[PDB]
Amino acid sequence: PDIQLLFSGFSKTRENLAVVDELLTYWNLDESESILDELEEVLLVSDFGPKTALKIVDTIRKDILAGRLKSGPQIKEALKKNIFKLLTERVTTTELQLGNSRPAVLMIVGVGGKTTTLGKLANRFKKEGVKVLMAAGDTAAAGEQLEVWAQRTGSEIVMAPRPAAVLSQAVRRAVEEDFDVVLCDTSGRLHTNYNLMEELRGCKRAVSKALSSAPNEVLLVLDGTTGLNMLAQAREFNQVIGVTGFILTKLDGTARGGCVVSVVDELSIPVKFVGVGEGIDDLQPFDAQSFVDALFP
């Protein structure tokens, strides 16, 4: 978890949020409700969604009316703590759960971003001495793009033609050849239809048939530049297949960084990685405290 990569990645979001400090020099009990309305609107500008911003600021209001918070600096500290709590109190661990046995199998799903993320995940595993096999289940440039990442990261790759058969072939090969992790690509569209839905579920079934412990992770890749708008496709994908974690890409230069909090809060599924740059190492594991410190240093 590279702190300066996270810090630079959230610089545009942090710039909108910087007005919060200015706003809270103006705090006293008499002028509080107006100031908190303005605070809530600052959060909405950074894509904390209406419900998330409501609950963050509502907790602060109760604490003020109860006498627990009685200064700008104290309110600022409560804001940070409440955001940390929203990111952590309900969700399971941000860590990948690879289990006891090998191979672990990770399915990557979502609506090019997926291909890039797949490559950067492979690079992380390779750096730790882990033996990776990629599976090109997005059936045709997708397969070729994935091949470049394989060669680039020193991973092996299984290619096509039916996605389910590609995935099951890769899982079988990994079990036979003592691979530690299989990284699967899958087909997806912005709007799911019956057929695409049937295909993705069929992929999950083929994977579980080839290896009953699989998939260990289903990771949904979302474009952070769409901000809160990503919730619609996230809800849809989770209806198709049990998503175990999110990967939010392209957060670098987004001003809409509050969407990270909203997606965790609304969907009760952890964000596991954030993409904070174009570099191969710019896919970072998510940590709630580091994220909060990046928005509010």
Is position 33 an interface residue for a copy of itself (rule: CB under 8 A)? yes
Is position 145 an interface residue for a copy of itself (rule: CB under 8 A)? no
One residue of 37, 89, 198, 281 binding a copy of itself per CB under 8 A: 37
CA atoms of 207 and 245, how far apart (whole Å): 18
- Smallest gap from residue 136 Cβ to a copy of itself (A): 16
CA atoms of 31 and 28, how far apart (whole Å): 6
φ/ψ (deg, to 5) at 222: -125, 140
For 128, the 3-state DSSP assignment is coil
User: Which residues, including other chains, have CB under 8 Å from residue 144's CB and lie 6 or more apart?
Assistant: none
- Smallest gap from residue 148 Cβ to a copy of itself (A): 18
Is position 44 an interface residue for a copy of itself (rule: CB under 8 A)? yes
H or E segment at 59? helix 50-65
CA atoms of 248 and 100, how far apart (whole Å): 27
Is position 47 an interface residue for a copy of itself (rule: CB under 8 A)? yes
Task: Closer to a copy of itself by CB, 26 or 177: give it.
Answer: 26
Is position 265 an interface residue for a copy of itself (rule: CB under 8 A)? no
Q: How far is CA 225 from CA 20, 68, 185, 230, in A?
A: 22, 37, 22, 9
Task: Closer to a copy of itself by CB, 54 or 160: give it.
Answer: 54
CA atoms of 156 and 184, how far apart (whole Å): 12
CA-closest candidate to residue 246, choices 216, 223, 214 = 223
Is position 177 an interface residue for a copy of itself (rule: CB under 8 A)? no
The first and second tokens of residue 57, run together, are 């600021």
- Smallest gap from residue 37 Cβ to a copy of itself (A): 4
Task: Closer to a copy of itself by CB, 112 or 242: give it.
Answer: 112
Q: Give the orientation angle of helix 72-88 with respect to helix 288-295, to 10 degrees.
A: 150
- Smallest gap from residue 30 Cβ to a copy of itself (A): 9
- Given the rule CB under 8 A, which of 39-47, 68-76, 150-158, 166-174 is the region that contacts a copy of itself? 39-47
Is position 45 an interface residue for a copy of itself (rule: CB under 8 A)? yes
One residue of 41, 89, 144, 177 binding a copy of itself per CB under 8 A: 41
**Which residues ranging from 186 to 245 are in contact with a copy of itself (CB under 8 A)?**
189-191, 223, 225-230, 232-233
- Give the chain's radius of gyration (CA, Å): 21
Q: Which residues bind a copy of itself (CB under 8 A)?
A: 33-34, 37, 40-41, 44-45, 47, 49-50, 54, 111, 189-191, 223, 225-230, 232-233
